[PDB]
């Protein structure tokens, strides 16, 4: 699964 802390600027939810 992706690491949501790899880039904090990315919000995975749509």
């Amino acid at each position, epitope marked *: *699964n*992706p*690491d949501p802390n*790899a*880039n*904090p*600027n990315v*919000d*995975p939810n749509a």
Partner: antibody
Amino acid sequence: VQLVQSGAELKKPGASVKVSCKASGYTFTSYAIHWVRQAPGQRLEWMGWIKAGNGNTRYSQKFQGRVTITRDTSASTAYMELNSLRSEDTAVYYCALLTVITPDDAFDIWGQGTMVTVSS
Amino acid sequence: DIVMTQSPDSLAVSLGERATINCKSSQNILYSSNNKNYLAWYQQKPGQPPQLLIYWASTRESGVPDRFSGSGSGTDFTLTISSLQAEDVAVYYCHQYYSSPLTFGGGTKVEIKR
């Protein structure tokens, strides 16, 4: 939304360099500033990010013990300090708002880059 | 690291022709829970910072010309320029934000034959 970096510098081996990244045109505290190295004949190398709000950081393992990223909210500026400079550290250093993807915005901005040359 | 491998390393096409660049990730970067590919495409011209073209592997950034399109899922991704114009000569990089550290591809240099 713009990012303006400090000018090119020359440093002796073993010294330190401190590159600034002046941000404008957006809410500074809302996003993370990344730092990315572009060395000759090498692919772009992520070094770390700092959350401009609370100052939390994450560094790559390649620079963990030798880079320090900080920010100054009053001046809307992020900084990248690299210690114990090696002649192999000669590169272009970018600050960048990498892949800002929010429920309301989507943008990506890089600074113009800063040549750092390490030489005697 | 997630290794991003681009093919070919350089590409020469005539003006108005179609250019295809492949990027392969060493690890699956599709998240099944949201069906998103954590991949971006950048364009860099000499002396300039990279500029974002595509994110989520297929969503165009605002203001990017429609001739740039991204496709693929999982480990195999494609950047297409449907009809090259003279200002499209540059180095094109893929980029993953699936896991830390963020990594970039080796670049594909696109040149024009005339």
